[PDB]
RNA sequence: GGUGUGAAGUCAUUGAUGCCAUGCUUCCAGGAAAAGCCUCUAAGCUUCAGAUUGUAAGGAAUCGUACCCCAAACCGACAC
RNA sequence: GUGGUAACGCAUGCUGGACGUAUCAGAAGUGCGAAUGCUGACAUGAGUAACGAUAAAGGGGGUGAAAAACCUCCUCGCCGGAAGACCAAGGGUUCCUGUCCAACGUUAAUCGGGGCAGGGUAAGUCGACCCCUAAGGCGAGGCCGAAAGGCGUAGUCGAU
RNA sequence: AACCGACUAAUGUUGAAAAAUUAGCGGAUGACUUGUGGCUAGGGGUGAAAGGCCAAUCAAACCUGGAGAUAGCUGGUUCU
RNA sequence: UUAGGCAGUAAAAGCCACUUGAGUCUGGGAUUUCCGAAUGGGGAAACCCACUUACAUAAGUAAGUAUCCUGUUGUGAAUACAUAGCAACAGGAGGCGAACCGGGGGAACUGAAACAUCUAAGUACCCCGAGGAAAAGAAAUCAACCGAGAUUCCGAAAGUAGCGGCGAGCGAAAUUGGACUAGCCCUUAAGCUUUACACACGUUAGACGAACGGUCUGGAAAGGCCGACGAUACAGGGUGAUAGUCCCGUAGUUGACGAUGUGUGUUCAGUGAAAUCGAGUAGGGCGGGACACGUGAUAUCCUGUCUGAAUAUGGGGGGACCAUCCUCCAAGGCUAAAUACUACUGACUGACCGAUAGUGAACCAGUACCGUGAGGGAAAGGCGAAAAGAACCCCUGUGA
């Protein structure tokens, strides 16, 4: 049965990637939040 | 090494540098082949190069 | 225009390997571990200058480093760029 | 600044080897000294069973006066501009 | 934005208030209008987005003083 | 294992859903774009620079390249 | 063992290996069997069900501490528009070799996509990069908007 | 036939599987089906319309915060 | 500063050094890949591709090249002029950060034992902008016919007066006790910032640093017994059990080349700054909002809209409004301290925790793991004084 995760790298990057996060105010808020939390991985 | 390098001109400083760099090449080749027993010399030449590159940066401009 | 400093940094070590040995014996090819930045032109220059040989061809690959577990902490080894350098016929290194 | 140094005849103040003299071979940064022939421990090596010295606390050793034939404390004084150790009892400068 | 270039009047917030005294948030916008003012010194029209109050101020002070004030504020006029 | 040395190597028939075919015919629902490319001149340059055709010499980097893919290696918590 | 009406106290053997604490005051994270409480451990069911397509095995030999399961040989059976061979994606060393068999592998395992070590990916022509653009994205100025921003021109990205 | 689907039955229901398998069944040049990439976002989208679907969730997603909402209810509440 | 050192895991190895180039400590230089505001352009962050100018001759190297704002130079349309535009140059800015601060927007659950006014609450949250603080501030203020004298913060007055589906609730001031105190200018000030010159003054590596033996128990003595001794040092920690006298310290006494910080002068160059005493202003009408005050009899303040004076013979306020009287002078500015906060650095403290506690995290933790993602989010400390971590032998698969 087709399950929900049908990964493509390009779609992962364009949605959740660093340059995508950095493009928007609220994305930067996420990166800053994760950077404050101490998260090793800021982006996907 | 040391301030001796500062007595030397920028030209002769560069001449040392190239020699050191060549010695450092030989030691890499030996280290890989397993001919190098005296491993202490690698850190020596590497530090000696830095001393020269320090002086050369001093001698640059001033 | 490749400087001598560049030439003295490009070749990191010879590569020792059954495959490397075959290459040398069969196809007159010396396998080196070259710097990651090294380009096929820089590698040819370096091989010619530092070994006084005439190079026919340079083929390069990067081997991506192995992940290793080392008890608790996983970690990757470093990527190696190797250069298969074919010497012209008659030349030995 | 260190009272006990390598190559210092000492007398052991504490432990199984109390009152036994020896030379400080090594001074570990953990505050431990190895002393020739002191805290001997039999180590089962893979080889044989071999006696080896074991580090002792530096505080468990004392400089040996030799002249007084006792343990002594060490102070520091300046003598000819250089700092020198001296024995707290005699007042004599240690050989160093 | 809905901001008078002469006065600085911008939209303010207040309440609508029903007979039952229900307060809903509302805005009070400035009566902004666009008007081309001929400015003699510069021999040109200058189109301003200004409140009707702003116009009255230009009638009292003249365009030259008002343009000066604005340019100082960093209005692009 | 290695090397070494090696015969014949044609004809007919059948025949793709492959090719000619981005074709042809026809239909209506009327069938990408842009560049490379050819050509034309403009401003501009006219012993030039350029263009064309040719002949030498040299170059063509960098990154991927293992392996799995009707799956025990991907998506399904599983050698599903 | 002993004492008190009780909460509990006291003594003491063994264990243990460095703290404990009278008395009188003082202060509380001060007392648990329940909350389909929370965390960990360990029971019961129970050596029970099941061991994942009913395509199927049999035998000789080998290696090994040990072989139904690994290697090898002879037979048998099964798929064959696939249960074969490739590619993209996706994964990321799983590839090859040596070695090991604790855990992992629904059994054992000498075997393994397991552990450990070493090796392995060679390009002017394949692909990416690159030139070009689609949908669309972003978007100098701009227009618009309390702010944040929205829209959009020139552009610049964007392959399928 | 492939492919897409999902009408019946049986199995399965601590599954081989959080929707399948087996035997049959429908569509199969079209209002078809499929890959890649785009766009629409929560009182919002999208809907050949079932309140269907919007990550195994939907008469208002999910996450975090207001937040220890509130709970005239239920449970529980520890020595003598 | 001084006998050892070459980071740890982590042994080895090759070495260095031993009275000062071993090394360490502090400071200051140098170097400082790529990504990231990321800024030459692009981009799936850590990659790809350029132009210009120099150089190289080969197909390289170096440097430079963002956008905006402000200013200054040039150029320079439609029409003359001009402006727009365009370019160059200079100076700024951009991002991050736990809280504190000012401002722009701004809920709901909830309470009211239902609910709509009201409450929650101008809270949460979003946004913008600071600063070491911010803001506020030098009476068009109060008072009450006596007087006070900016602002801020703290104690009272006081849960008082009031407000309020007069419900739930909300909640002042006068006045008074304190902390701190400072005012200064639009005929151009005080302050602030810079700049140097001085001087002080502190910080920044550190150094020296008292005094215990014997005996007993024990694996070990710091314990016991005996007798000593220091104390401007019995803080604290370590050492084979519990140490004033073994060690590191502590008290005390000293130390800075250089570098920093601070405060004074003495300078500089700015800023303050709005110029010139306040008109589209005060006041008014309509709609809202803020004041404890819910429009009420509702003064005062702010203003979206529409209006609109007087101008010291004047004007504002004194809680509807009027008279009288008093008090102040709005429509221009600057101003320390007392106040707020602590992510970060140091020291110290605890009737705070002691591994299910204390941080989520004592341990390689915002990790593993879960999730497309935002995001969620663990478990897991303890041999011994010292590894002395069990040579060798035996069973076993050179296993376990």
Instruction: Specify the DSSP class assigned to residue D30.
Output: T
As beta bridge partners, residue E28 has E12
- Asked if C32 and C80 touch (Cβ cutoff 8 Å), the reply is no
CA angle, E37 then E41 then E47, to 5°: 20
> Would you call D90 helix, strand, or coil by DSSP?
coil
Residue A27 contacts residue A21 (beta carbons within 8 Å): yes
SS (H, E, C) A3-14: CCCCCCHHHHHH
Ranges of H-type helices in chain C: 4-10, 18-27, 40-51
Q: Do chains C and B touch (3 or more CB pairs under 8 A)?
A: yes
Name residue, tokens 């000696």: B48
- D57 burial type by CB count under 10 A (0-12 exposed, 13-18 middle, 19+ buried): middle
- Contact (Cβ atoms closer than 8 angstroms) between residue D63 and residue D87: yes
How far apart are the C-alpha atoms of C5 and B22, rounded to whole Å? 9
Rg (CA), chain C: 15
Q: Is B46 at the interface with chain C, CB within 8 A?
A: no
Nearest to B21 among C5, C13, C14 (CB): C5
Tell me the residue ranges of DSSP E strands in D1-96.
9-12, 21-27, 32-35, 40-45, 48-53, 56-57, 61-64, 71-72, 74-79, 82-87
Count CA atoms closer than 13 A to C47's CA, side-chain side. Answer: 31
CA distance C47 to D71: 68
How far is Cα D42 from Cα D51, in angstroms, rounded to an integer? 4
Closest partner CB to C8 (pick from B25, B31, B32): B25
Q: Report the C-alpha gap between E12 and E2 in whole angstroms.
A: 10
| Protein chain E, residues 19-38, with a C-beta closer than 7 Å to any atom of nucleic acid strand I | 20-23, 25, 28-32
- The answer to whether the CB atoms of B32 and C4 lie below 8 A apart is no
Whether C35 and B48 have beta carbons less than 8 Å apart is answered as: no
φ/ψ of D32, rounded to 5, equals: -110, 140
């Amino acid at each position: 049965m087709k399950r929900t995760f049908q990964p493509t790298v390009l779609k992962r990057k364009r949605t959740h990637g660093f340059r995508a996060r950095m493009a928007t105010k609220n994305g930067r808020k996420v990166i800053n939040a994760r950077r404050a939390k101490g998260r090793a991985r800021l982006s996907k | 090494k040391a301030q001796d390098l500062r007595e030397k001109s920028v030209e002769e400083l560069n001449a040392e540098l190239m020699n050191l760099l060549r010695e450092q090449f030989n030691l890499r080749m030996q280290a890989a082949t397993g001919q190098l027993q005296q491993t202490h010399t690698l850190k020596a030449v590497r530090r000696d190069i830095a001393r020269v590159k320090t002086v050369l940066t001093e001698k640059a401009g001033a | 225009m490749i400087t001598e400093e560049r030439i003295l940094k490009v070749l990191r070590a010879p590569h020792i390997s059954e495959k490397a040995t075959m290459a040398a014996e069969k196809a007159n090819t010396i396998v080196f571990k070259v710097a990651k930045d090294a380009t096929k032109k820089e590698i040819k220059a370096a091989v010619e200058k530092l070994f006084e040989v005439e190079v026919k061809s340079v083929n390069t690959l990067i081997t991506k480093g192995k992940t290793k577990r080392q008890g608790l902490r996983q970690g990757r080894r470093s990527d190696v760029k190797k250069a298969y350098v074919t010497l012209k016929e008659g030349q030995d290194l | 600044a260190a009272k006990i140094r390598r190559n210092d005849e000492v007398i052991v103040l504490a432990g199984k080897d109390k009152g036994k003299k020896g030379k400080v071979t090594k001074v570990l940064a953990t505050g431990k000294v190895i002393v020739e022939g002191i805290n001997l421990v039999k180590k089962h090596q893979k080889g044989g069973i071999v006696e080896q010295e074991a580090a002792i606390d530096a505080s468990n050793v004392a400089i040996f006066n030799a002249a007084t034939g006792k343990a002594d404390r060490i102070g520091f004084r300046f003598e000819d501009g250089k700092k020198v150790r001296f024995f707290k009892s005699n007042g004599e400068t240690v050989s160093n | 934005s809905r901001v008078c270039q002469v006065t600085g009047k911008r939209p303010v917030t207040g309440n609508n208030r029903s007979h039952a005294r229900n307060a809903t948030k509302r805005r009070f916008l400035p009566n902004l209008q666009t008007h081309r003012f001929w400015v003699e010194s510069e021999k040109r029209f200058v189109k301003l987005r200004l409140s009707a109050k702003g116009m009255r101020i230009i009638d009292k002070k003249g365009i030259d003083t008002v343009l000066a004030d604005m340019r100082a504020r960093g209005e692009n006029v």
